[PDB]
Each structure stands twice: as structure tokens, then as C-alpha cells.
Amino acid sequence: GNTTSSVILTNYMDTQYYGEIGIGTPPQTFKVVFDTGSSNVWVPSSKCSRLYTACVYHKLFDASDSSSYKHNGTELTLRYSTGTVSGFLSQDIITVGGITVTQMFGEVTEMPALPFMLAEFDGVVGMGFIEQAIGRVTPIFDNIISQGVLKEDVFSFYYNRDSSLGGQIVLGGSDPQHYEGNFHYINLIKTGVWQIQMKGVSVGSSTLLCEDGCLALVDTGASYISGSTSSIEKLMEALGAKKRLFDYVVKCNEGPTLPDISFHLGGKEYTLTSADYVFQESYSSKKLCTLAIHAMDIPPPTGPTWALGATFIRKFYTEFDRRNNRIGFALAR
Numbered sequence: 001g002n003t004t005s006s007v008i009l010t011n012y013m014d015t016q017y018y019g020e021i022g023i024g025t026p027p028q029t030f031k032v033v034f035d036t037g038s039s040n041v042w043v044p045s046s047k048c049s050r051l052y053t054a055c056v057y058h059k060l061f062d063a064s065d066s067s068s069y070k071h072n073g074t075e076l077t078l079r080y081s082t083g084t085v086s087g088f089l090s091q092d093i094i095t096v097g098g099i100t101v102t103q104m105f106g107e108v109t110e111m112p113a114l115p116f117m118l119a120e121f122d123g124v125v126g127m128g129f130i131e132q133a134i135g136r137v138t139p140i141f142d143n144i145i146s147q148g149v150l151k152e153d154v155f156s157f158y159y160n161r162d163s164s165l166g167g168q169i170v171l172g173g174s175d176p177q178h179y180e181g182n183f184h185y186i187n188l189i190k191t192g193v194w195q196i197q198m199k200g201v202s203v204g205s206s207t208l209l210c211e212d213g214c215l216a217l218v219d220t221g222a223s224y225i226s227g228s229t230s231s232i233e234k235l236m237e238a239l240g241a242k243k244r245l246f247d248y249v250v251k252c253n254e255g256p257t258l259p260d261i262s263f264h265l266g267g268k269e270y271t272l273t274s275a276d277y278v279f280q281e282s283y284s285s286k287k288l289c290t291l292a293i294h295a296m297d298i299p300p301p302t303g304p305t306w307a308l309g310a311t312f313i314r315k316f317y318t319e320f321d322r323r324n325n326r327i328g329f330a331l332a333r
């Protein structure tokens, strides 16, 4: 097949990037985040108790409203760093862009208030490998490969700066409009996860972290860049940032003067200036500005690892290659 189809993404405050997918006949619309860090697709369910407030505020899937719905009903539990969602498995036809697929997805009957009452998205579409899929359910992208409609077996991500297009994901290729130059490709350490070897982390001129090498998970569902607590504690100390309850902050006036942060991947230096990784709401010295970096300790086998999230993707257009098991990087525009 020659097909390459694009899905438009809505950018909410440079934290949450989501798009729309139909489910069933007639299609039921859902706002979903496309996450390379998880392999499962799930949406809120009409069987979700209203005692969970998230199921009131978000859109619910009604199985009996779709004639293509096929019952499964196996228990499913997904674990994130934030907590757990629970539900049961179902199967229906899912539309993404111009592509339709019959897909096994979760129907979530348990949706904790924290985080999900802060979610502008209804659900998640896992772009990860089947190796990470709870219940070993075929991921959506694998079902798309089987259809052989794609021009290529690769898919790419584009995240924009809030201010116009929000963001775009392309299935089957990349969009030259949103990147310049050529892609620099880096192989995955192993199949089953989107992760690449990182040869170190630099603050300004000196490389202060990840000196002997570390893991970098490219995560399209990650809002920030996240490293191990040990790494971050040293990074923020070097930047002079102060730890709040949630975030790391710096005096808003000092933000533009913070040094650059470079990530060394595939022998090349990937730099993020203070303008890239700092939220500047004001430049006043009397206000504190949030940093787009924080600490998250990812448990093995996946961790300990860095996570390169929207902060990183925003500057660098990312191509995910299934056929060759590699990740391309190009300057975003």
C-alpha cells in the first residue's frame, strides 16, 4: 500500500497532546493520547461507576450502541507511575485517520480522580510493542502493519509550541513540512520498547551526568523530560533550581540565563536551551517559573531510565521505525 495518513493533535498548555479516534458502528469519538511508553489502548467505559468523577467528566464508550462490538470481558489492569486503572477487554472497529482496524482494547471501569480529573484526554492509544502489552493483546499499530496498507512500517510524531497547528502524528511515514534536514537514526537497544543508548548528559560545557552511559526512553505520552532522582537532583543543583512539592522552579528572570542542556545520542549532541525547557509565564524576579524537567524513577526492566517527553519531542521531530527497529531525529519546524 501507498497509504500515509495524518492525525491532527490538540496542544493543551504544552503538557497534554491528544487526538481523535472513532470506535464502533456508528463511530464513537474519543480524545486519546498516543503514547510510545505503553502498549495498550483503553478508553472510559459506560459501565464505569459514577462514583469515579473522571467517568462523569470524560466521554464513555457504550458497547451496546455499536453493532460491530464483540464481547470479551477479561479483566485488565494497567499500571502507570501515577497509579492503576482497571476494566475489562473488548473488541470493536477503531478508526484512526483514514485507517480502520478491528482492535482489542480496554474498557476502564475504574478511573482514579488523581491524575485523571486533570486529563483533557479521554483515553490512551499505546504505540509500544506487544512485549509491554498487559494481557499480551496485539497493539493497534501491529494490527495496522498486518493490513499492509502503510507506505512504510514507521510512524512519526510532531509536537508544537502552544500559542495554528497543535501537533501531528503520521502513520506510514513522516511529513517533510514539519522537519528540516535529514533524519539522524539511532537503533533500539532491544525490541519491545522504544529506548536508545544515551552516552551522557551535559549542562553547559561539561558533561556532568550519565557519564558511563544510561537509558533513554522516547515517550510521546511523557509531558516533561524525566530522569532518575539521583540524576535530576544533581541536574537541578547545577541549574540552581529549587524543589517545590510538585515541580522544580527558578526565578523567572533567571530562566533565560540558565545554561543549555544537551543529550548525546548516536554520537550527536541534542541541545535544549533554557527557552526550550522552561515555562516562562513572566520574566519578573518576584515570580517563580516551572521547569519542564523533573524526577521519575522507572522500575526495571524498563528502568532505571531517562524519559524524553514532549519537552524533547517539541524541538526534534521524531520518527519511530518498526521495520528497522530505530528512532529517527530531525530538527522540528
Ligand SMILES: CCc1cccc(-c2c(F)cccc2[C@](O)(CCCNC(=O)OC)[C@@H]2CCCN(C(=O)C[C@H](O)CN)C2)c1
Binding pocket: 015, 016, 017, 018, 033, 035, 037, 038, 080, 081, 082, 115, 116, 117, 118, 119, 120, 123, 124, 219, 220, 221, 222, 223, 224, 307, 309, 310
Ligand atoms: C496517558 C498517559 C498518562 C498517564 C497518567 C497520567 C497522565 C496525565 C494526566 F492524567 C493529567 C495530566 C498530565 C498527565 C501526564 O503528564 C501526561 C499527559 C499526556 N501525555 C502527553 O500528552 O504527552 C505529550 C503524566 C503525568 C505523570 C507522569 N506521566 C507519565 O508517566 C506518562 C508516561 O510517560 C506515558 N505512558 C505523564 C497521562
Ligand SMILES: CCc1cccc(-c2c(F)cccc2[C@](O)(CCCNC(=O)OC)[C@@H]2CCCN(C(=O)C[C@H](O)CN)C2)c1
Binding pocket: 013, 015, 115, 118, 221, 222, 223, 224, 225, 226, 246, 247, 248, 279, 281, 289, 290, 294, 296, 307, 309
Ligand atoms: C506544575 C507542577 C507539577 C510538577 C510535576 C508534576 C505535576 C503533575 C502532577 F503532579 C499530576 C498530574 C499532572 C502533572 C503535570 O501535568 C506535569 C507532569 C509531569 N509529567 C512527566 O514528567 O511525565 C514524564 C502538570 C499539571 C498542571 C499543568 N502543568 C504545568 O507544568 C503548568 C505549569 O505551572 C506552567 N508554568 C503540568 C505538576
